[PDB]
Amino acid sequence: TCPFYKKIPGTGFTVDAFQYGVVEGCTAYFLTHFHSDHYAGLSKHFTFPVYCSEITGNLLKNKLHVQEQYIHPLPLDTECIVNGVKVVLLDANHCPGAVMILFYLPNGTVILHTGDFRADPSMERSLLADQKVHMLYLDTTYCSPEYTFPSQQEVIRFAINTAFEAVTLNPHALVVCGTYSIGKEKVFLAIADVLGSKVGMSQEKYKTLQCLNIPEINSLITTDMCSSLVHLLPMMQINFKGLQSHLKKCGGKYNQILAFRPTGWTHSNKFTRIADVIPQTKGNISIYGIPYSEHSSYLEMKRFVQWLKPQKIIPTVNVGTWKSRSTMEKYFREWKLEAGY
Ligand code: NI
């Protein structure tokens, strides 16, 4: 059964609610983004209306085979009427195709559902500038002050410089990047661009990238691994055993691997600056863990919320323990007393 924080009161709508069978009263199922925890349940047998972005719609059709007749893509930044209710989709600064949803309820209440997001000051100049929000359904993944990490631009600077230095010292080094979902594509695209290479990958991953409306993509990626000196591998293979096994397959073309594992936050963030990051090394294999986040830091979250001044906040992450719920409620009250709303 569908939990309360996935229902939108006063509408026939749900958000990210496909794992509960037929939800009673639901006339339109919104999908914020193509990540498995959120789409859990969709398939070719789905026969209700799905509302989403263009990019999410391309993925539903090609990767999950949802039939065309049930996919409803909406443009961003545009007032749309759905089943008699005005809605707007906004860029969530999460993975490709990810949105926030603004719902203008028939009774005058305005609701913002963030989906998954990485808050940014640019959101203060979207269509959110114009008006009041009564309820915020918030991505609270990192709602505690210990969760710190650098900007995505600093992380990409570190990865480009690390890869360009290594391959210039040794033209016979291969670079490998881990992946397990959409998102974080800048890591492997920026590294391949500095090395003058296409990115090599499986047919399955190529198919997924072909759904993402990335400009000039045909110039950036390929399934011909032999032509490429940046390879993508499943995240599970990014370890000394998996990488040894991969280097054997490359026909003596390479004598060294440099690998990247994009993670979210890890506790080495509590001590080590991005500059000072060092790899794990065995022989001719080195592995860097880099903290490339597609969720708000504590500080980015707090800024957003203090600017928006919502009347009520409903967390959508970390909701399963009393201690997590209590901790998040305390910070919401500080933020409100500090800013005066
Ligand atoms: Ni996500």
- Alpha-carbon distance 174 to 229, whole Å? 5
Tell how far the Cα of 96 is from the centroid of ligand 1, in angstroms: 10
Q: How crowded is the C-beta side of 71, counted as CA atoms within 13 Å?
A: 20
Under 8 Å between Cβ of 149 and 294: no
- Alpha-carbon distance 191 to 314, whole Å? 39
Dihedral sign for Cα atoms in the order 259, 216, 63, 94: positive
Tell how far the Cα of 129 is from the centroid of ligand 1, in angstroms: 25
Among 228, 167, 34, which Cα is nearest to 219's?
A: 228
Tell how far the Cα of 288 is from the centroid of ligand 1, in angstroms: 23
Tell how far the Cα of 94 is from the centroid of ligand 1, in angstroms: 7
Sole residue written with tokens 């860097």: 288
- Alpha-carbon distance 132 to 120, whole Å? 19
55's CB contacts (< 8 A; 6+ apart) are: 34, 96, 97, 211, 212, 213
Q: H or E segment at 150? A: none
Tell how far the Cα of 37 is from the centroid of ligand 1, in angstroms: 8
Tell how far the Cα of 151 is from the centroid of ligand 1, in angstroms: 18
Among 331, 312, 339, which Cα is nearest to 143's?
A: 331
Buried b (16+ CB within 10 A) or exposed e, 297-336: bbebbbbbbeebebeebebbbbeeeeebeeebeebbeebb
- Alpha-carbon distance 71 to 58, whole Å? 9
Tell how far the Cα of 130 is from the centroid of ligand 1, in angstroms: 27
- Alpha-carbon distance 18 to 46, whole Å? 9
Output Rg (C-alpha) for the chain, integer angstroms.
22
Under 8 Å between Cβ of 273 and 96: no
For the chain, list the domains and their CATH numbers: 1-147+296-341 (3.60.15.10), 148-295 (3.40.50.12650)
> Other C-beta atoms within 10 Å of 11: how many?
20
Tell how far the Cα of 116 is from the centroid of ligand 1, in angstroms: 5
Tell how far the Cα of 261 is from the centroid of ligand 1, in angstroms: 17
Tell how far the Cα of 281 is from the centroid of ligand 1, in angstroms: 31
Under 8 Å between Cβ of 137 and 5: yes
The side-by-side arrangement of strands in the sheet containing 80-82 is 80-82, 85-91, 99-104, 110-113, 135-138, 312-315
Q: Enter the resolution in angstroms.
A: 1.4
- Alpha-carbon distance 112 to 102, whole Å? 5
Q: How was this structure determined?
A: X-ray
End-to-end CA distance of the chain: 35
Tell how far the Cα of 284 is from the centroid of ligand 1, in angstroms: 34
Tell how far the Cα of 233 is from the centroid of ligand 1, in angstroms: 20
